Structures are given as structure tokens and as C-alpha cells.
Write a protein that holds these residues in place. Structure first.
Motif: not given
Lengths: 218, 164, 206
Positions: B136-164
RNA sequence: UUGGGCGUAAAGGGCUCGCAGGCGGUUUCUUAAGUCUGAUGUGAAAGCCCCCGGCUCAACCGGGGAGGGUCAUUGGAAACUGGGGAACUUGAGUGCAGAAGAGGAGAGUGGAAUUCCACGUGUAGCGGUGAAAUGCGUAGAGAUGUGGAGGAACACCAGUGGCGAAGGCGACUCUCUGGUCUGUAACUGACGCUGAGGAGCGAAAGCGUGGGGAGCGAACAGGAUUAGAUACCCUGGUAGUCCACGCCGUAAACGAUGAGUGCUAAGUGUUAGGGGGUUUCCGCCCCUUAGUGCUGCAGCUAACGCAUUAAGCACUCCGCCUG
RNA sequence: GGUGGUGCAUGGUUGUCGUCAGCUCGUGUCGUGAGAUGUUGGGUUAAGUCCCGCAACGAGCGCAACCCUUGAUCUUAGUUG
């Protein structure tokens, strides 16, 4: 109507604070603006139901409020899809299999009493059977001819119908319903913020939904 | 959301636990079994099933796991970042690792991650040794994981500057 | 404190005795030779398998009817063998005998045949779990209304015995209208003794 | 610390005041101790690590690098932590007007009783337990009507009310005296928080000295019960219980939850207020602080359950725990 | 050949609580887990008997009946009655 028939509000002032926190000086109830904010969301639900009818899904109307069952009953019949009128027995959707396999017994009994055997125990069989017929069919209602899970649900009081909305969540059925001020708008996909106590308003709006889908059909 | 059954899923029986109930006529025994089920592309999820017979109890468990499934991000066959699983005194740490290390985890944790198909990952178990709570704990963590692209779109930014 | 035998209870009301002859002053020896011929034919046909054999008397001439489809195969190739064995029955009874073979279609719902099947599967080293769980569903899809089957003895765990039974269906034993056919069989194993009890609900009687 | 906890599992000191110490509201100049970063000088060789060469791979042996200072001199930067200077007022206080209270110490005062005594009347038992018995009564009991003598506690009001930091604090009046809340904006302008040692308080029992002693009552006696009953029950009853001054320093001293600060859905009582809307009538409602309860989101929880009086989200300081 | 041992190696039988009214599972829900629900709450009967509610909906073994026998009578049969 699109003017305020009976949508004024609830009887008392102990309620859920969900979306009531930044409204200006209106009245005893601070919430006049529902009379205007209701119309656009009714329109949104109208479009949603139009799309449901267009793709051919079958909505059902569920209600146990003592002043709503007959209304949803008559409106359901001539709208042409399913409905609940009595005790919302638990876990119907999540145990459809049980419900289909038990209403199948009802259908076999209609066959027995219409064409099949009618006379084996000239008193006993009839007296137990007919009672069993009315017993189960009264509780079940217009849920007889399902043979498929509904594409969406329409509730009349998510507070009284805790089990209904709760069952809807696990199956992720898109869900609609009128929402009294003592209800919880959080979990339902479209909110029609009217007063559940308004015996006139409930049928005025459910009819406005029935004719909506009927016109969407053609 | 629910992931349908249009997939090829393997099941790894992590444990069957003897279970008993006390009644007037002595003791009443059953069998409780939990199993993690899911494809290697990235779909996972556990289930449970209690009954008096081990094989059909496992059948119950696999049906439950099929009914309840979850997705996971898979950036480079490895998690994108740090995460701690925080379910009921079940503490699990996960760290992305280089592309040759492999899977480094405990028994139940290794079963879950390997079934997910993560090729290169390291972890650690800091809470109780209870298997189901590990899951249960590990799957909660795995759910909590976040891709980079949705993070970029949430921030209104793009992957190139998010990784830069 | 265990149950009464169901066919033991149902004899004579919904079941016939499987020994349909009247005697008087000869009851004892008629009965004795009935058991003797039963024992002989059961022993020497066990491999071919047979469930129940009825005996009938006329003018001091015994006559028999014997069940199961396998003695059907004993008709053709064993047609010589049928005469050969019934010669032995003639010798035993003193007065010559007549026989008949009746084929039990759908053997999956004969209690004694099922019991013998289970006994054989047990004695050739197959697990009670596989054997019993497979046979129950075999009979059910063969078309019984309900089955309960049970084995007892040192079930693999040689150091101590126990009891176990499976069942799926409707099986009323307390009702005196059902047709609960019953059988039991004994299976000898290396690690002890194994007994089997199987009965099936076929249907009511009217 | 990186990397744990303290409501019931081990763990919040009994409570408070405070030296040292640890922490520090907002703006603005300046100083560079902390801070970050160059240059230089070293941090031996041989080791671990990198790259090459050689013993017929290497074990090993070479050659060249790199790393290795809470390091010395010197230069550069000033956002933050320190230092200095000038502001400011929300934090913290002072003044001003009210309000409440079993807050504390001292003196006196009063009402119903229990007991004892004398007195009138008064016959035969009174008292007591599951039954009984010991006891008290013809030397006149108990009962009942008077009058005294005394010592203890303050009935209803009294309410999960109020006050106090905690122990705790209830009859009345007076003398002295502590703290709190409300509204202000007139004042000072960071004066604040916490706090090892230290100091003081700290129920009841207990001890010392001198009084006082109604009732209750350890000890003790008698009568019951019991196989036994050194007890449970009954009748007595010493010490104590009370007062003045000292001493002990413990309690399940409990909300089994340290102190301070800020934030995070509601509903509902109740205590002391303040403002406003209809009247400056009553009493109707709306805001509003501070308490003091009860339900209940998110959140936390191992479960119970806590939930603006957090056991939630966070920061400082102390104490405590590691089968 | 063992009526020789081992009922704590067993089969197969039998007593007992007890003819007491309980005992369970399918599927689904809640819990994290042991687990709970159904199986509880109103009355009801002898009863988990029935009905009414109820996150339960059903099913199975139990109870009842189906069996025997004694109680009134119709038809058939009248011998050895």
C-alpha cells in the motif's frame, strides 16, 4: 419556465459550506445568485443529456424522497428509460449479475402465470406466488429490462441516497442530480442547485430533462 | 478512471496467510491471499481474497487485482525523481538509478516493481515488515510520482527550460 | 452420532428392494444364496464395474438383471464369457439360472459407479483434491441437481486422519420425497485405509 | 542532524519566577565577524580513485594525474545571520473607563443539626443486620418540651458555573492584597519567548511544640459470619481529623497531552463583555473579543480518537524515552 | 492362525450437547487487518416461521411439509369374517 418557479431555497440555515463563501449582500439567505447561476448549469446538464441521448445511452432516475417517487415515475415512463421508485436496494450496479439473475425469475414467473402452468396447487401456489410477484416488483420497479449498465445516473437527493452516489463512484458512471443546500456538491460531475423539498420544482425540472432527451432523440 | 482488461497481465503470489476464527466448535480456519497483478508496460495493482481453499482464494485475489489497477510513469524505464511511500507506518524510499543497476528492493517491493517492469531502480524499506502495508505504501508513492510534461504544462512552461 | 442411511430409509416407499422375490420357510437359504451370488459376481466383475444387481425367483429358477454399460462390452466379446460365468452361477445355485444385462446410460450419476471411480483414482496415487473436485463437476454437468461427496482416513498426512467433503447444488436429505441415491466404497492405500461416501440428488418423485 | 519518538505501547518535570545560555517584529544607511568566491603557500612519500607502461593478464611493480584542510596571507561580493547608526508600530507594556469572580491572608459575626448535661412528662424496651448478637434501659432508657455547653462544616442558591500557574478555592461582613478580560489609541518603541542549575509554592497522610476535641475514626476490645476471618457486617473507641508556628516534599499532583507564536471548513450550547440595526421600552436579530463545553470537515492516527481549547500544518526553548 | 496389542494410525458404525435452533457459502460492500454485513433492528411463532425496515441481494444444510400410524366417512370386495 426559466424564471424562478419554486427554486428559492431550503427550509433551514444549517448547511454544507461548500460554495457559499464569497457572496455579497443578498437576503436572509445570502444566496439569491443561485437563481441566476442555476440557469447556465441547467443548460450545461441539458447539453450533457443531449449528448447522452445522441450517442444513445440510457439514463435512469433514482429517488426515494417521499414527495418525488411518483413524479420521477410518470416522467420516466413517457421519457422512455429506466427509473427507481422505492427502496434503493444496495449494490444494484456493482452486483448487476445478481439483479439480472433475480429479475429473470420474475420474468419466468410472468411466463408461468400468463402461458405456463397456472393450476397445480389451486390455493397455495397462487397465494404465495402473486404475493411474491407484487413483493419483489414493487421494490424493484422500472429496473426490469436493463441487460446493460447505465451510461449515466440522475439522483434527486444525494444525502438520502448515500448508497446510490457511493455505488456510482466505484463504477465511475457520470453522475447528475439536483443538489439541496444541505447536499455535498464535491463528487457529482454536474450540479443543479435547487431545493429538494420543492415538490413543484422537482417535477418542473425533471420534465425539462425528459423533454430535453426526447427532443435530442430526433 | 479504471484501466480495462484489454491487456496481458501476469500475477505473482506474494503471500498466502493462514487465518483463523474462533467459534464454539473449536477453531474455524480460512485462507487469505494477496497477489500483485499487472503487465510489464507499467500497469500494476494488488488484490486480496479470503476463502477456505487456496487455489480459488487466489482466484478471488487475482479477480480483485484485475478489478483494481493503477498506472505509473516510466521515464527511461525508471522513476523520474525521489518519493517516499507514507501509508500507515509503511515507509519506503525510492530513487532513480543509472541504466545498468537493476532492481534493488525487498521481497514484496521487488515483486511490485518488477511486475511494473521498472528495469533500473533502488529502494529501501524503513517501516514495518508487513507485506500488505509495504504494498500500500509503495503504490501510494508510485501514484504520487509525476511525469515531467504535465509538470511543465501545469507551470505553463516547457520541458526544455524545466530540465535546463 | 451420524445420519441414517438415505437409501436405507427410502427403501420400499420410493425404492425397490433389488431382491424382488417372495419366499416362506425358504427365506433364510434363499437370502444366503442371494448374498453368495452377489458376492461372486461383484468380485469377478469389479474390473468391468457394476452398480446394482436384482434377483428374481420363479419355479425355483433364479433369474438376474445386471447393470452398467461396461457389461454391455461384456455382451459382445464376453458373450462367450457371459455363458462361462453363468455356468458357475448354475453350479453354485444347483438349479440353473437366467440373466439379463441392462445398460446404465449416463454413468456419471450412479452412486456406486462414482464411488468406485473415486476409489480407483485414490488407490492409483492421485490426490483426493483433484479426483473429488473433478468428479463433482463431471457429475453436475452430466446433469444432476446436487452432489455431496466425502472421503475420510489418513489423507496423505499419514500421522493423523481427518474428514473432508465437497458439494455444489441442492441436496435435501431430510425430505422423504427426493431420489437421493447413495453409495460408499473402500479404498486401501499404503499409508492406511480410505473410505468414500458419495450421493447425488437426481430429482423428486411424483 | 543525514535519520526516531513522548494521550493509552518507554517517555511532558507537580506548578511557577527567573541568573547564565539558546532563540529575535518592519523599514533604512553603514561594518564585514559569520557568509560565498578568486589568487598565492603548503596538506611528505607510500596507500584508496582515474589514465597509461611492465612482470606470459594480476597478485604486484612502475610513470603521470586527481582528490584530501570547519588551514595561513591576500583580493573581490553584501542578499541573509551577527556589529553600529537612524526610522516605524502590529509584538510587548504604561495611562484612561468599566466588569466579573469559592483568588489569597487577618478579625469578628450567624443558622439547622450531632453529642453531653440539668430540668418536665413518660412506660418497657431502644439500637442494630441478610437473619442476629455485643451494647444502652426500672439506678427509669429511647421518645418527647424546654434551657444551656462546646467543637466541626457552611444546606437550596449550585450550573460539564466562576477564579487561580498548580495544589486548590463555596455561610455573612469588614481590613489588607494578587491576577484577568473588555473598549481605547494618549503614551514608550522590540522593552519579546523559553529556561539547565537556583528560589518559592506544593492535597492527604506523617513529624515537633502548645492548645482544642462535637462527630467521624487507623490501632485496639466485644458481638456476628466462616473450617479458619488477624477482614467484609454490628456496638464501642485511642491516635489523627481542627487551631498557631515550623518540618517532609510525595500523589492516577491526569486532559495519563510542557511553554510561546502564526495559519487551517462549519454547526451548537453556555460565562464576562463591546458595537450596530427596529425603541434611548422590554425582547428579536447581526457582528464582535475573551473564556468554558458538545458534535463535526480536511489533516493526522496502528486503533481508539483529536479536530481553532488539535493529538493538524509549521518555528524557537526546555524536560523526558530507547526490551 | 491370530476374541494378541495399538479406537491417540483408520475405515465403517454409535452416544452426547440436541429435535436444541442454529450453522454456512456465492456475489457485492465497509475496514488495512484480525474481521463485519447478510445472519442485526419491530413483532411473530416451536422454529434463521413470516412479514416490515435495513449495503446488502440470493443460495445451501438445518425447521416445516413430502413418509408411517391412530382418530369421521365414500366406492370396491364379502371368506376362514
Amino acid at each position: 419556465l426559466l424564471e424562478a418557479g419554486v427554486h428559492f431555497g431550503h427550509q433551514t440555515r444549517r448547511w454544507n459550506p461548500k460554495m457559499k463563501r464569497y457572496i455579497f449582500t443578498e437576503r436572509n439567505g445570502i444566496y439569491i445568485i443561485d437563481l441566476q447561476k442555476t440557469v447556465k448549469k441547467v443548460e450545461e446538464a441539458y447539453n450533457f443529456t443531449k449528448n447522452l441521448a445522441a450517442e444513445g445511452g440510457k439514463i435512469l432516475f433514482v429517488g426515494t424522497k417521499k414527495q418525488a417517487q411518483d413524479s420521477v415515475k410518470e416522467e420516466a415512463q413517457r421519457s422512455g428509460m429506466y427509473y427507481v421508485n422505492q427502496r434503493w436496494l444496495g449494490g444494484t450496479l456493482t452486483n448487476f449479475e445478481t439483479i439480472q439473475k433475480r429479475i429473470k425469475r420474475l420474468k419466468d414467473i410472468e411466463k408461468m402465470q400468463e402461458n405456463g402452468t397456472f393450476d397445480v396447487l389451486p390455493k397455495k401456489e397462487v397465494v404465495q406466488l402473486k404475493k411474491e410477484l407484487e413483493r419483489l416488483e414493487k421494490f424493484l420497479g422500472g429496473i426490469k429490462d436493463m441487460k446493460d449498465l447505465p451510461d449515466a445516473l440522475f439522483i434527486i437527493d444525494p444525502r438520502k441516497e448515500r448508497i446510490a452516489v457511493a455505488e456510482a463512484r466505484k463504477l465511475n458512471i457520470p453522475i447528475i442530480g439536483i443538489v439541496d443546500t444541505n447536499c455535498d456538491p464535491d463528487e457529482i460531475d454536474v450540479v443543479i442547485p435547487a431545493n429538494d423539498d420543492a415538490i413543484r420544482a422537482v417535477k418542473l425540472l425533471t420534465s425539462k430533462m425528459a423533454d430535453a432527451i426526447l427532443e435530442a432523440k430526433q | 478512471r479504471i484501466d480495462p482488461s484489454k491487456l496481458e497481465l501476469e500475477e505473482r503470489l506474494v503471500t498466502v496467510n493462514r487465518v483463523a476464527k474462533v467459534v464454539k466448535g473449536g477453531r474455524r480456519f480460512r485462507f487469505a491471499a494477496l497477489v500483485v497483478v499487472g503487465d510489464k508496460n507499467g500497469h500494476v495493482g494488488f488484490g486480496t481474497g479470503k476463502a477456505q481453499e487456496v487455489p480459488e482464494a487466489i482466484r478471488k485475489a487475482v479477480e480483485d487485482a484485475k478489478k483494481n489497477l493503477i498506472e505509473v510513469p516510466m521515464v527511461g524505464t525508471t522513476i523520474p525523481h525521489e518519493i517516499i511511500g507514507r501509508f500507515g507506518a509503511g515507509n519506503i524510499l525510492l530513487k532513480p538509478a543509472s541504466e545498468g543497476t537493476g532492481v534493488i528492493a525487498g521481497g514484496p517491493v521487488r515483486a511490485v516493481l518488477e511486475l511494473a517492469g521498472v528495469a533500473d531502480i533502488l529502494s529501501k524499506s524503513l517501516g514495518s515488515n508487513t507485506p500488505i502495508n509495504m504494498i500500500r505504501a509503495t503504490l501510494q508513492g508510485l501514484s504520487e510520482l509525476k511525469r515531467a510534461e504535465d509538470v511543465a504544462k501545469l507551470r505553463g512552461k516547457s520541458v526544455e527550460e524545466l530540465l535546463g | 452420532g451420524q445420519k441414517v442411511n438415505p437409501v436405507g430409509l427410502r427403501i420400499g416407499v420410493i425404492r425397490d428392494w433389488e431382491s424382488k422375490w417372495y419366499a416362506g420357510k425358504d427365506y433364510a437359504d434363499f437370502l444366503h444364496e442371494d448374498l453368495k451370488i452377489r458376492e461372486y459376481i461383484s468380485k469377478r466383475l469389479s474390473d468391468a464395474s457394476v452398480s446394482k444387481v436384482e434377483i428374481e425367483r420363479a419355479a425355483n429358477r433364479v433369474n438376474i438383471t445386471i447393470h452398467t454399460a461396461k457389461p454391455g462390452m461384456v455382451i459382445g466379446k464376453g458373450g462367450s464369457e457371459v455363458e462361462a460365468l453363468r455356468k458357475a452361477l448354475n453350479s453354485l445355485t444347483g438349479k440353473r439360472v437366467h440373466i439379463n444385462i441392462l445398460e446404465i446410460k449416463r454413468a456419471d450419476l450412479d452412486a456406486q459407479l462414482v464411488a468406485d471411480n473415486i476409489a480407483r483414482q485414490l488407490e492409483n496415487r492421485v490426490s483426493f483434491r483433484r479426483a473429488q473436485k473433478q468428479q463433482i463437476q463431471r457429475t453436475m454437468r452430466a446433469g444432476a441437481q446436487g452432489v455431496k461427496t466425502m472421503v475420510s482416513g489418513r489423507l496423505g498426512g499419514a500421522d493423523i486422519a481427518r474428514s473432508e467433503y465437497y458439494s455444489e447444488g441442492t441436496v435435501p436429505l431430510h425430505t422423504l420425497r427426493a431420489d437421493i441415491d447413495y453409495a460408499t466404497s473402500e479404498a486401501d492405500t499404503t499409508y492406511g485405509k480410505l473410505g468414500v461416501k458419495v450421493w447425488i440428488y437426481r430429482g423428486e418423485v411424483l
